Swiss-Prot record:
It comes from Arabidopsis thaliana (Mouse-ear cress). InterPro entries: PROP1-like_PPR_dom, PRORP_C, TPR-like_helical_dom_sf. This is Proteinaceous RNase P 2. Gene3D superfamilies: 3.40.50.11980, Tetratricopeptide repeat domain (1.25.40.10). Belongs to the PPR family. P subfamily. Keywords: Hydrolase, Magnesium, Manganese, Metal-binding, Nuclease, Nucleus, Repeat, tRNA processing, Zinc.
Amino acid sequence: NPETNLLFNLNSCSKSKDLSAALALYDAAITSSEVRLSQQHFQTLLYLCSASITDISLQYLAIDRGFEIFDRMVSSGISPNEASVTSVARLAAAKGNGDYAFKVVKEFVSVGGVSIPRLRTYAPALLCFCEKLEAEKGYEVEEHMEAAGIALEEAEISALLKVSAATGRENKVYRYLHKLREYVGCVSEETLKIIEEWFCGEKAGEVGDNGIGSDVGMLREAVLNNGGGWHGHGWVGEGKWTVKKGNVSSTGRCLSCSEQLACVDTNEVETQKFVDSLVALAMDNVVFSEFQDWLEKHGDYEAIVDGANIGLYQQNFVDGSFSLSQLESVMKELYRESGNNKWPLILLHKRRVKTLLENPTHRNLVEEWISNGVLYATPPGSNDDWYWLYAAAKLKCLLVTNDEMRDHIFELLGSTFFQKWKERHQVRYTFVKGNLKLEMPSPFSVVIQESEKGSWHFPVSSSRTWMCISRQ
Ligand SMILES: [Zn+2]
């Protein structure tokens, strides 16, 4: 078949990205048999056109050809492909005509049958509008983006931030800086420069004062309610900005302004969704239903320990197990750290618990824990238990485990939230020819933080570098 030979040649070109040769085949194809071109043909062509954009020696023709080529099999009546609509959008946005990029996507999301509207489609439309400083246009595409709707990755927000800065929109820069906090922690270098230029901007300094102006009392109460990080109400204080780029202390005190960063507080809606996720995989039982009911009755525990992890650490699979000596130690250190009120729950398998019961030495002590409620026996058939993970997350309390748990089963669930929660809650231990030295979750967040006085702090993507923002 002549056409199938053509698809081989088109794909052969796309491999080596020779769009000029692909163009000659395309021009020849319209003349040749006459051929009817399958949708794959200029799928390949449009895909190659955008691939060409980044290159210079081929870009200019791709712009000229891309629109007409696109319109050629659009004529066939196939609702354009999600990928293809991104391609023409890139071509448009690449050289001036951002508005075509916007308009084709809007017409696209209208279909909805197999629209599958991806952010990357919306992207070139917004970026081009941003570079041309069309602010209201950019806000409008964002509004549609939220509506469909994929939330914004960093690149899109930073570009949106840049425009509000250039157009001197005070309130919009405030919103988008908060938008950045919510969806990014440590920021890129490119964005960092954008943030820096705004605060040094005379517009920001002069007008920045807003009233409000008061009061720190309401602010500290409002900053607390939203976690450590931020208060919603607006701008604070009067005068011009002072910008400092500095490291931070072990205590998390910013060296420049002598204020320490608040602890990261994980998002509530995120907490429940993590809980719901693990719980769902659990029922596929009544034993776990007992556990849910059980914990609520016995609440609440300030810390929780991974029983298995402690005991096998650090002796070899001789079996060399099982060190209740090491388990008993963590209980001892934690109580004084926790103080005189609460004891840490330990989750161990019945197998481990029964063998411990069998030992005459340990039996009185372990039973004391079980009767008190300081020990719980995970039933057979399960698992690398979420029993403590659930309990730690449900109580939003501490977790004691040496598991990095960087495994496929864990990592599929493991996200951006997971690393936040781990730094937030995980405790680590080391044992050498003595007793435990306890590593703790960091007292301060590594994330964008907002203060009632001023203040804006930005980490950068450990001798980490930060940005400090101070008013007067
Ligand atoms: Zn500071």
